[PDB]
Symmetry: C2
Subunit: 292 residues, 2 copies
Amino acid sequence: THLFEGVGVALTTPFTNNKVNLEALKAHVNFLLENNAQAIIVNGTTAESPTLTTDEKELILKTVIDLVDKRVPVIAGTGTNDTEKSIQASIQAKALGADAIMLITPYYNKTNQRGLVKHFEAIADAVKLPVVLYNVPSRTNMTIEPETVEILSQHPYIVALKDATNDFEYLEEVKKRIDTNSFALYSGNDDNVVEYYQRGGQGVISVIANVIPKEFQALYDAQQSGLDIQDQFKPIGTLLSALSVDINPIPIKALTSYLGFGNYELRLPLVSLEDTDTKVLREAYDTFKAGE
Amino acid sequence: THLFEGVGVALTTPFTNNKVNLEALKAHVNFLLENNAQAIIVNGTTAESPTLTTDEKELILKTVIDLVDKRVPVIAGTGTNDTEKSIQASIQAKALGADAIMLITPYYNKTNQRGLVKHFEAIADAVKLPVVLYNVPSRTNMTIEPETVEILSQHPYIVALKDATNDFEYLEEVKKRIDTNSFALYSGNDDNVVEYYQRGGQGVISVIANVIPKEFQALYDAQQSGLDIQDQFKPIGTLLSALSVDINPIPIKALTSYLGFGNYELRLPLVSLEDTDTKVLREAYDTFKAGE
Ligand SMILES: [Cl-]
Ligand SMILES: [Cl-]
């Protein structure tokens, strides 16, 4: 059984005075649950994981696990570019009660495909918990080659790929090598979901679902029920275009804060949008909501 | 007024049974000093900094600082994609006696140009020690735009750039905006030094200088004296082509181990070359040394 199908949320971290705001975190998670999120991915890219302390990550994860209490899978981003540290974090996430972990490829150091196999298999072996691989070449400058995905999919605990390649030839090459019944493919790019779903993907791990979880999940459910969703996607597409103004999560946090979840604060080296851009983006959100 | 000119070494970390081998580290540093290295860059990309523990980094740095004892600048790689942690590491590097620190741009999270300014200035402000910026888009998928280099060069403690863009139009744009007397431009790609020196660069921070420091420094000194160094570079170019077989430092550690510094071991997620490739690269090194 897949961990989930449809829209998983790449959960943001709410800050107030550069401190994780647990009240806002809980309120945000409650909002996502109420609006049909299918999974919560915690301490990932959108959570600003590179700038969180270990104590913050563990606190956030435990808070989300306890609040969700089995309503949807809670998937802990634990992977870094250091295999040993990834092992430690993964084991601790399991101990806290995570349903799965997510492991990005290395970055900055990178590695070759043999190294990817050793890295991911070592962490999967240690944790003995479902593992979602995460491939995002735009951030890592490396990839999980389709042959490598095939090898990894045979590992008993490696069960899915968050595929942010935005490359549909890659998708087809992966599909011909894996079994979709036991190895899920989740888009890691909100922009491509219409085609990703049409081409047999299992869902998405989404940035924009932080603020429009209901509408974004409705897209998946609509196509699952046999609707065409090209027209339904259009206004979401317009909002995603507005969201492209800067590097995620700089823009999305303009919207989570707008909805009352934390202040509009990013931790260095990230920075907030300047006021004019913040206003335009919030107006785009308002326009989207008005148009429904 | 520059920390150094010519060849700085992007120092490797010698491992024996996955433990930093201090005896090999000291032997390697002594070899570099004996063979005209102009600076030693410690705990950078080539050192496998992403997989080293903080205790290991500090031990390595103190060991190098104490051994070198002011013979050449010891430049501590302390920058990460977390500004706060970069501040702590930089302050500690200063306390240990580093002459300068090196700060890569963020990666994985990345940031925008305003974020770069905040990130680098925050660390520079805290450490009050010469700072070498490090731009390597092939590992970070971001850059330090020429206008940003200009802004940063005005900071009293930001004194140089390790430029691994391999973009000579970029170099010319940077040169137009900075004062060469007070802001040094070091190549971060061994392959381009002939053109880099002739376009007015101050040197290189070098991977291949881990094993041929004397020959690589001789290029810089040769061109300094007014000689054209294109033909002199040719055999080094051939060795560099052999070194391109995999992602640094996977190949260079085949050669440092061959010279007796430490075993041929990389820490995960990196892996060693397979035996056939190890043999070919070592043969290329021997061919180069023969050929002198
Ligand atoms: Cl939030
Ligand atoms: Cl070494």
